Design an enzyme around this catalytic site. Structure first.
Site, PDB file in Angstrom:
ATOM      1  N   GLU A   1    -121.883 -20.563 -30.728  1.00 18.39           N
ATOM      2  CA  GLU A   1    -121.912 -19.744 -31.936  1.00 18.39           C
ATOM      3  C   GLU A   1    -123.308 -19.839 -32.543  1.00 18.39           C
ATOM      4  OE1 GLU A   1    -119.751 -17.550 -32.927  1.00 18.39           O
ATOM      5  OE2 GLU A   1    -118.463 -18.252 -31.288  1.00 18.39           O
TER       6      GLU A   1
ATOM      7  N   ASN B   1    -126.460 -17.427 -32.084  1.00 18.55           N
ATOM      8  CA  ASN B   1    -126.746 -16.954 -33.436  1.00 18.55           C
ATOM      9  C   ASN B   1    -128.248 -17.071 -33.700  1.00 18.55           C
ATOM     10  OD1 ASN B   1    -124.647 -15.880 -34.873  1.00 18.55           O
ATOM     11  ND2 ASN B   1    -124.461 -17.597 -36.302  1.00 18.55           N
TER      12      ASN B   1
ATOM     13  N   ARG C   1    -120.426  -7.362 -33.431  1.00 17.91           N
ATOM     14  CA  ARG C   1    -120.236  -8.714 -33.960  1.00 17.91           C
ATOM     15  C   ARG C   1    -119.111  -8.840 -35.003  1.00 17.91           C
ATOM     16  NH1 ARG C   1    -121.997 -12.402 -30.613  1.00 17.91           N
ATOM     17  NH2 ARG C   1    -122.022 -13.836 -32.386  1.00 17.91           N
TER      18      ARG C   1
HETATM   19  N1  LIG Z   1    -130.467 -17.740 -37.073  1.00 22.23           N
HETATM   20  C1  LIG Z   1    -130.113 -16.742 -37.946  1.00 22.23           C
HETATM   21  N2  LIG Z   1    -131.096 -15.935 -38.446  1.00 22.23           N
HETATM   22  C2  LIG Z   1    -130.789 -14.954 -39.299  1.00 22.23           C
HETATM   23  N3  LIG Z   1    -129.554 -14.655 -39.757  1.00 22.23           N
HETATM   24  C3  LIG Z   1    -128.563 -15.459 -39.257  1.00 22.23           C
HETATM   25  C4  LIG Z   1    -128.733 -16.504 -38.393  1.00 22.23           C
HETATM   26  N4  LIG Z   1    -127.491 -17.079 -38.124  1.00 22.23           N
HETATM   27  C5  LIG Z   1    -126.643 -16.404 -38.823  1.00 22.23           C
HETATM   28  N5  LIG Z   1    -127.211 -15.427 -39.531  1.00 22.23           N
HETATM   29  C6  LIG Z   1    -126.520 -14.376 -40.478  1.00 22.23           C
HETATM   30  O1  LIG Z   1    -125.115 -14.667 -40.656  1.00 22.23           O
HETATM   31  C7  LIG Z   1    -124.264 -13.525 -40.240  1.00 22.23           C
HETATM   32  C8  LIG Z   1    -122.958 -14.096 -39.805  1.00 22.23           C
HETATM   33  O2  LIG Z   1    -123.079 -14.941 -38.647  1.00 22.23           O
HETATM   34  P1  LIG Z   1    -121.748 -15.325 -37.911  1.00 22.23           P
HETATM   35  O3  LIG Z   1    -120.755 -15.827 -38.874  1.00 22.23           O
HETATM   36  O4  LIG Z   1    -122.113 -16.189 -36.738  1.00 22.23           O
HETATM   37  O5  LIG Z   1    -121.300 -13.860 -37.317  1.00 22.23           O
HETATM   38  P2  LIG Z   1    -121.979 -12.895 -36.273  1.00 22.23           P
HETATM   39  O6  LIG Z   1    -122.733 -13.706 -35.230  1.00 22.23           O
HETATM   40  O7  LIG Z   1    -120.732 -12.236 -35.614  1.00 22.23           O
HETATM   41  O8  LIG Z   1    -122.792 -11.935 -37.027  1.00 22.23           O
HETATM   42  C9  LIG Z   1    -125.115 -12.865 -39.195  1.00 22.23           C
HETATM   43  O9  LIG Z   1    -124.676 -11.515 -38.931  1.00 22.23           O
HETATM   44  C10 LIG Z   1    -126.551 -12.943 -39.846  1.00 22.23           C
HETATM   45  O10 LIG Z   1    -126.751 -11.894 -40.851  1.00 22.23           O
END
Ligand SMILES: Nc1ncnc2c1ncn2[C@@H]1O[C@H](COP(=O)(O)OP(=O)(O)O)[C@@H](O)[C@H]1O
Ligand SMILES: Nc1ncnc2c1ncn2[C@@H]1O[C@H](COP(=O)(O)OP(=O)(O)O)[C@@H](O)[C@H]1O
Lengths: 115, 136, 136, 114
Positions: free
Chosen positions: C45, C49, C104
């Protein structure tokens, strides 16, 4: 990662090895063998590398270590069931002019006049 | 073109993970298994040097492997920041070893060359020893 | 104590390699398939991510994973040197994503939240992200 | 990483996955499937997760992506032979609302007129 099966027949000690014989695991091998020679009259050693899926220089040493141990009492060390990988490390160093490599535990014990 | 970088405590029970995590990376090329045996061994010799020598088994030291792949060739690196080597010419000399007491065969370096295609040891006293083995 | 750090390129081809590596080093703790799969999934994840939110799938990006082990805790910190998070409270909300285009879901942090005892995130816009995960 | 076997039983697409379903692989599946929906008139999908070894959020995402196209043609998305850890994701993302689960593949087909 490394298991050890020991057995003492007559004045020989058969050490069978399963797994990766490396720096970390080479120490338990040492403790036990040196420990064992410390407790019994051992003239010879037969090392069965049959189940050895990995050996490094940290393995030659534990061998040569014992090699010098048995040399001191006029006995021999014979290794058997040696893989291609392990056998290559024996040529590299030049141990192919040091111990007796046979094909299996039986021909090893045979090379030692074991009843 | 891809790369990976591992670092971990200078405990002996990390030496397998080290090789394994490298073999895990070096696998993409879809190698011959002897090619993977050579790599795991090589890695194991260098990493062992670092821990038992370079860091004198001091668990605090940090062994640093790095794998760089490009145009097929492999560029494996291994560095440490410990004692380093006094004599790079007296070291590559087959069978030589400073810790004879520690049943240390003195094969480590000679093994890296039978297996790896190119070798380059770079050390500095107290600066730490950095070794570069390249497999083509 | 016993620790490890692993950096690699921002390519999904290394995500399975990275998931396993993190898992194998945790293995030292005699953990189950429940614990083992949780940790692994919590890592993909955060890793995947760090790849499409911080580094927008540019392979030239490098991800970092810290699995510091002290007593019974697996201190995990996946990290980024990418975009960062403008609204943390907004992303820390269930089912929020910013790429409806890659299909996503927003579960990333709920999984992290649910499979780990703590998911702390410190991120500064265009400073990158750092996921301070924990478990015991 | 993933082995994808697909079979079409009329207006029903059977997707049999084996391996891992993570970001990398999801895209390969998201790719192989859409090519079927475009070339054949699929009304429902049976999805056999029995031989799957791993899945992250990307898996929930690629599957939800397939329901949309399936909702259009008035069809059912049936995921069968689900392992707990997975069932655990469906159960955490509330994918269950939009996705129906069945013991095995044959109970899925019973649900979809066969
Ligand atoms: N490394 C990262 N850099 C920038 N934004 C991030 C990062 N990790 C998470 N995010 C933000 O958090 C949101 C939610 O992440 P998550 O809960 O993993 O869902 P998803 O991967 O399905 O979008 C992402 O869509 C993004 O906007
Ligand atoms: N990373 C290192 N740091 C310091 N000295 C090293 C390092 N690597 C090798 N050496 C020196 O080279 C000697 C020989 O190394 P090698 O050929 O690998 O055999 P061994 O590891 O069995 O001693 C070591 O005993 C040490 O004196």
């Amino acid at each position: 990662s490394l298991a050890i099966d020991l057995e003492v027949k007559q004045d020989v000690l058969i050490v069978r090895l399963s797994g990766e014989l490396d720096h970390h695991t080479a120490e338990e091998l040492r403790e036990q063998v040196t420990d064992v020679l410390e407790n019994r009259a051992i003239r010879h050693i037969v090392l069965n590398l049959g189940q050895l899926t990995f050996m490094d220089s940290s393995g030659l040493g534990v061998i040569l270590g014992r090699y010098k141990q048995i040399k001191n009492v006029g006995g021999q060390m014979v290794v058997c069931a040696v893989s291609p990988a392990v056998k290559r490390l024996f040529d590299m160093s030049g141990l192919f002019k040091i111990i007796r490599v046979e094909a299996d535990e039986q021909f090893a014990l045979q090379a030692l006049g074991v009843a | 073109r891809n790369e990976m970088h591992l670092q971990f405590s200078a405990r002996s029970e990390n030496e397998s993970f080290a090789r394994v995590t490298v073999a895990a990376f070096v696998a993409q090329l879809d190698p011959t298994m002897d090619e993977l045996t050579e790599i795991k061994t090589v890695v194991s010799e260098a990493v062992t040097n670092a821990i038992i020598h370079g860091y004198n088994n001091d668990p605090n030291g940090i062994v640093s492997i790095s794998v760089i792949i490009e145009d097929g060739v492999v560029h494996l690196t291994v560095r440490d920041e410990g004692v380093g080597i006094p004599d790079i010419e007296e070291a590559r000399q087959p069978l030589f070893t400073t810790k004879p007491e520690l049943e240390r065969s003195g094969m480590g370096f000679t093994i890296m060359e039978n297996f790896m295609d190119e070798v380059i040891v770079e050390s500095e006293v107290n600066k730490g020893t950095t070794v570069y083995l390249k497999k083509h």
